[PDB]
Design a protein around this ligand. Structure first.
Ligand SMILES: [Cu+]
Ligand SMILES: [Cu+]
Ligand SMILES: [Fe+3]
Ligand SMILES: [Fe+3]
Ligand SMILES: [Fe+3]
Ligand SMILES: [Fe+3]
Lengths: 156, 156
């Protein structure tokens, strides 16, 4: 089962939603924190809106992005939980996610930093292209942006 | 306007169609053969079918694949034209494609070799995951396969 973190935010011709669930098992092994050592599996569900400037039809998953997360416990006496999400596929389709260990129940601040395919930070920069010619060309990639939400962790 | 290469073939829970159009200009530069040095831009349009075993909803583009192509001129006294396609986005959405120089008008044989994200040959093996756990898990990736077509090049 999936639990939402705030309401989805629409930016750069995309709908950015943040959900969480029980920790997961993934292939290749050694990328995700072990489920037994994790608290949640945090996800970034990024999908195209109508008239997306980079050629994606409505509802399509936006691939080859790189998402960095920052999770801070509201009022908590702990450091921010940071990490990088990974592109993966599940029963609900492709998404960006990571297995995370939290700092107990309470209110938390979540911040995602979405990097375009051409970003200096994006390892998949040389693997994904964009047509520029008049006939089949699309608009330049969006510039790196951040997105925040507040959520109450109860303990799932 | 795109021109078709035979009829699409349905394999491994996907619909595999081969098209071509005029050569393109792509960002980043230095990956595609120059449009002035090319004859066509060959594409592989791979989309999910209903009941796709790896979690893709119907119509969705299948990402992180690696496609190798082999183009032979029927009866022609020329070497086969080979290469690797690249994941890119255009006005019609994401796909795999490459700029190719043909050997004049005539009948041709096209052969694509589709590699799953976990393939030894696929550079994007450490970049794309798959849930394996009972609840959110999907079926293992398809095994590497080939698809062939015959087409008549008239000259764009
Ligand atoms: Cu995931
Ligand atoms: Cu292309
Ligand atoms: Fe393994
Ligand atoms: Fe294993
Ligand atoms: Fe999800
Ligand atoms: Fe196309």
């Amino acid at each position: 089962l999936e639990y939402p973190i705030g309401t989805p935010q629409n930016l750069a011709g995309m709908e950015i939603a943040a959900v969480y669930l029980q920790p997961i098992d993934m292939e290749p092994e050694g990328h995700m924190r072990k489920a037994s050592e994790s608290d949640i599996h945090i996800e970034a569900d990024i999908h195209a809106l109508s008239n997306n400037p980079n050629g994606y039809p409505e509802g399509f998953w936006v691939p080859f992005l790189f998402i960095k997360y920052e999770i801070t416990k509201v009022g908590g006496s702990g450091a921010p939980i940071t990490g990088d999400m990974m592109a993966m596929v599940a029963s609900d389709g492709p998404h960006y996610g990571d297995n995370v260990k939290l700092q107990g129940p309470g209110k938390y601040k979540v911040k995602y930093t979405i990097y375009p395919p051409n970003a200096k930070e994006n390892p998949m920069s040389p693997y994904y292209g964009r047509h520029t010619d008049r006939e089949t060309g699309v608009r330049p990639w969006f510039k790196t942006f951040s997105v925040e939400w507040d959520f109450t962790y109860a303990g799932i």
